[PDB]
Design a protein around this ligand. Structure first.
Ligand code: NA
Ligand code: NA
Ligand code: NA
Ligand code: NA
Ligand code: NA
Ligand code: NA
Lengths: 356, 366, 356, 368, 355
């Protein structure tokens, strides 16, 4: 399945004020086009685009798209550049690896959730929320609103206030949503460990699903381990790692119950699936930081996959508009069709309107 | 103390009841009585473990592989004989348990012989920390084959037992939590309750259960999680849960037990001597345990565990099956100490100090 | 049982000013357990005090056969935080060793056999190669050891550069010839890079082991590094306080041989725990000097190595305190079947040098 | 540079009122050594460090025979050079490692006082300058009640302006020491820091049992909960199976030993004692290591040096003293000791450690 | 106190390399100055962080309270949306200049304020670039010996073991024995190839092997190179924090840590790493930045060797500082001038400063 061309369409939409993404398309001599959109970059989008066209495309043009390990291995060298942020190469590699996978699922007439393991084809979906400042309303309104939308739960933002104050915020969300609602919390690396342990004990009776990135970045593995063992809530991390080796270090340290490694930031499905294999050997569950357009397939494929994540429409336009055949949530869950590849129909009006 | 003969008596108990499979099942239980004869008057003897399926391969290893390293040798040079015998574990082609069981069989009979020669009961020869300890029963089988939870618990109490190792691992956390609550409610507060999942849970479910039972004073939570990543996963049950964790019975060597302790997986190590190369191996584990502040248990085999555990400053509690799972403890030893209020007390009889029921043996051998 | 009736000690001092305490445990059966242990000059009377004021009470009227029981209560004297932990440990070793002699005698078993009975003969080497050549040139010293029928030498290094000490070690090997064990001992003298340098220089001299190559504070990890980066097996353990400390050495991968000293560390009961731990790590056992106890200890174990003594002028106890010392033959000592330690103490020498 | 001309030491011994039993140890005297490091610039670095009744003279000899010759004539400003040469006193395998380390700490602390004076800087600032105010608690709750009933002792600490207590345990069962701690909380009430200290007295299961029993009394930390031989791993277990933060380090000889505690996950707080372990130079290495592990720093007693050490560091916690009947030195040695107010003291801007030593007290208790 | 009154930066681009001169003004008359980093592409992003995020935490505060200021400054690294190096470089810039002010106020050279172990250490040059931009291997080596440098840090990581071994071998032949030779793979090899190379050069007295292996598993893989191979291993420059340096040491990855203060929050962070290193018997080095590393390394008992570039490769060390110490027998001796003690060449700064 020979690659003939790599096409990219940088996009910027509004509702900061804008979210950025890149649509990547891999054309083949069969008339099959692999397509995906990846990342939410922002200030670095065109540098990423450059890496895609100048560094990766030559490794790909004329090559067999079906030999994913061969191509991934040569494309990996874009991560070696010591004189720039390693994320740039990783996001660029993720973009092409994801679009290639979509082409390959298409050539094989297999949806990716099946090609990648086929464990199941439905999972729950939660919304990232509880933003400080009540942007999407009060805590209770936000929670009710997600329930209206038919989401299974929320990953609720903490990390900014005292343990006492954030516990009250979480108690409010649990109150509002009632018991039949998944509540995860996410500190975005905000707490000193003692404060995170304090918080974790205060919410021990609110059935919190996991506590994501509880502690400051520098000692995060060992300090989140201590949060996991002194506290009372399962711990989730991985999104901040660059590689499967980094996620392996989390697991080896005993830092985590759930790995939320982000394939869009970290070299794509090929990378993420290595992390998932590693997680099985540690009895660690897989999650995935946002990117529902690829995470739903990745997570469903796996026996140890958990929950997909998205934003409220007003905060992410891309999942809610750019995909014309997104399945309807039913009582919290999303079921994936048997459409080959990622199986998505992109709204090309929206793309034309917002490409830069 | 020269070894002259190695005699083994393969044995198969009557068709007893089997506690597995969702249904009524029956199976014969099997053991091997091993007797090490010596130039003095002394005969060391022990019996080791239910095997039934593999009993004759083990018997063959004993005679074709071990005996040649023993006959003519000095039984009192235990390390020399164990080291020479250890080679039976090397065979990559067969289950390693075959070799380790054969080695334990002989190593234990040899210890019984050495103690007789020195006129020492083994609990004293092995260290002599004390001569009495609690004994609990294994029970709480799914399907209530030994009665309701309550009646089963009351029964063990009336038998003079200190407590129970109660089977879990087969239901949800909530469901198994309720079974353990019923056991504590029935037995009251002065009864040891351990629980045993037989590697049945995924770690989050074990943790859920462990927390649910935090106020029932559960003594320990034995093999809570699946086998493949058991050391790290049970460490997490230990740290995220509320109950001490116990394991070691599934390990093949003291190296394996060392691995569990270094991972931080366990509070109690229940390494089984009879299926891991015998008391010489178990005593090495016990030593390693002291360096980690880990306590020693012993999966069943009361006939040897009573002495092993009692000898050690960090020994905990001896275990025994129901007669149907183990007719050997109950019928084949005619001078078992009588349980007094949870406790078993050991005599000063040299060796393991046991009088075997030769009528029982003559009727079930071959 | 075997009831202990009284504890007698006989503090001693002999010039070379080496110190030792003879301990005698008297029993019902008229059996007396006796041993000498240690060379702690300055602290002897502190140790002596601990035995009579702290240990003896836990012992008089107890069954000496119940070794684990008595060791467990005796161990509490190591809990005193206001004094060198070694004081309690050496006092406990004194009593524990004597008791074991009592038990061996009571059961008519030599300790080498009662402790496992692996073999009854082992090589013995002399600790020497002192700087300043007090015992003569390196060549003279090596030949003298061979005249005494010793299997080899533990040769002092740790005080010069790698190039100078490698040359000294080269001299030892050339004088002695290949059929002679040469261990080397830095007494925690080198920086790790210097020890690695030395180890590589002597890789062809068949050096049996490299004992305590590096400075004390980080010795486990640094000697691990000498072990892996260098070319000679590494030995340590004598500076640990407990079988826990030896386990830490083994778990770090610091050592091929553990030379934990029973007389400094709670006695045979403690050393045998260390021995057991070593089997689980495929580590061999050695024993820093104290041949009057180490011979039985090492000989009883399948993984035992070599016993050690000093030149007669450096330390006189081994050569004068024991009237029935076996004859060295081809470098090896063979132990009799006499029960307990089986030693006839030289009461001329004891009566002459005892003190209050 | 600041050339060292002379090293002078003054050993002291003072009697204590009664005996003070912890768990498996007790005390009748308080000994210390005052070290003075003279310089060609007229500045005298001074400190007193340690309590070492039995071995005081052994330590004094090390100072003079082993250390002084590496210091006389050298530049007191070159701390790392001096410390690197003095460190050899720790190498002798034939003697207690602590002898050398206490000797080294003695001169290192006095040399730091001289350097602070030369630079016109208080050490709490020279060493990092994070803050100049911190809480002080008293080490107390001794068994036998030699300072009075539990309640009386707590109230008295509150009347001295102290922030809380480090309360001795480790000697009884979990249920019994739990009762004693419960009594301290009830007496002091909630606005009072209660640490507990088993001095390595419990088996891990007993420490965990106690930890869990006191989960609701807001206990700040649990110091050396377990027996010494396997302490790092066993206190890790107390830390994760129990309910209160764990603290240790005082029993380690070096920063390498503290690093081992932290790597094992043994501790939330490291209470490494500078005056037993080579002085502020060694301690500040440990503090640096602690930052990389998100471990906080404490300091076993020695308030005359630990106030500056702890206050300098972002992750410094609580300074420690004893009741005056238990230790007269903090309370008599220093004429300008800052006042305890509402649990805290505030250090001045006086250069060095900033202390005026009470020569009238010193002369009454010096020995030879 | 030494109250900070103004944070001034001067971004520069010189032909060509890039840097920022940071100047911390105080209410005394003292101006702390340093230049730090080469960051061409993001220089202005950093400059912005300095003024918009850091300056407000510093104006009117006591420069003498270094732990306090560093603590509140450290938050510029929390930003999850940008490269963590942006904040860490900004933090290093102000922290280095703050230290120079502090040294000046206390009248102490920093090599002495930071410990004073010694005031003299060897300097090597980073070189042996592929494509021979500075001449053949033999001519480059001789050049460095003419300049009076102690040795070279010689680039590898790009070829096969046999081929890079030949190059390294030419360097030792050309230079002779009395010349320090470190090699640097810049994370280039798979472990087996680094091991092969290390064994091949076992006889060439190679001082250390910097960043031998690919990035993703570098800690464990470089430990294996260290133990299977024959040459000491050095790494640290690619770590973001003393925690990451601690991780290298705990894994047994390194003999030498070359943490770069300029990239990692300044001397305060590097000196924490330095303390951690004592506890592991790890030695300290420092990736280039000799204008700060000479003082950092000289102050520590376990400090090793300072690094610069050939003049044609780096104009800053060679031009920015008018009282640069002369190499003498491979070594640089630092003066007693307070702070970093450097006189900056303002003609050069005026020439190449940019906006
Ligand atoms: Na997150
Ligand atoms: Na916990
Ligand atoms: Na079991
Ligand atoms: Na030695
Ligand atoms: Na304490
Ligand atoms: Na480099």
């Amino acid at each position: 399945l020979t690659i003939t061309r790599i096409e990219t369409i940088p996009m910027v939409a509004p509702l900061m004020t804008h979210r950025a993404t890149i649509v990547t398309r891999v054309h083949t001599d069969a008339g099959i086009i692999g397509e995906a959109y990846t990342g939410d970059e922002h200030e670095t989008m065109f540098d990423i685009d450059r890496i895609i066209h100048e560094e990766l495309a030559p490794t790909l043009i004329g090559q067999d798209a079906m030999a994913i390990e061969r191509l991934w291995d040569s494309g990996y060298k874009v991560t070696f550049d010591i004189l720039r942020d390693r994320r740039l190469g990783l996001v660029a590699l993720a973009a092409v690896n994801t679009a290639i996978w979509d082409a390959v699922g298409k050539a094989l007439k297999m949806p990716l959730w099946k090609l990648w393991g086929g464990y199941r084809n439905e999972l729950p979906m939660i919304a990232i929320g509880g933003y400080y400042g009540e942007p999407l309303g009060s805590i209770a309104d936000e929670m009710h609103n997600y329930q209206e939308l038919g989401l299974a739960g929320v990953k609720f933002k903490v990390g900014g206030l005292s343990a006492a104050e954030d516990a009250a915020r979480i108690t409010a969300a649990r109150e509002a949503a009632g018991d039949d609602f998944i509540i995860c919390i996410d500190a975005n690396q905000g707490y000193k460990p003692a404060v995170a342990v304090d918080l974790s004990r205060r919410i021990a009776d609110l059935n919190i699903r996991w506590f994501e990135e509880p502690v400051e970045w520098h000692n995060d593995k060992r300090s989140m381990r201590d949060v996991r063992y002194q506290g009372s809530v399962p711990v989730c991390a991985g999104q901040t790692e660059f590689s499967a080796s980094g996620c392996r270090d989390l697991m080896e340290t005993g830092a985590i119950d759930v790995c939320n490694f982000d394939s869009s930031w970290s070299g794509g499905p090929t990378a993420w699936l290595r992390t998932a294999a590693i997680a099985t050997s540690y009895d660690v569950q897989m999650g995935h930081h946002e990117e529902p357009q690829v995470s739903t397939h990745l997570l469903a494929s796996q026996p140890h996959g958990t929950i997909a994540e998205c934003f409220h429409p007003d905060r992410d336009p891309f999942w809610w508009n750019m995909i014309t055949n997104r399945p309807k949530l039913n009582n919290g869950t999303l079921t994936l069709s048997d459409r080959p590849g990622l199986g998505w129909d992109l709204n090309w009006d929206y793309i034309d309107q917002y490409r830069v």
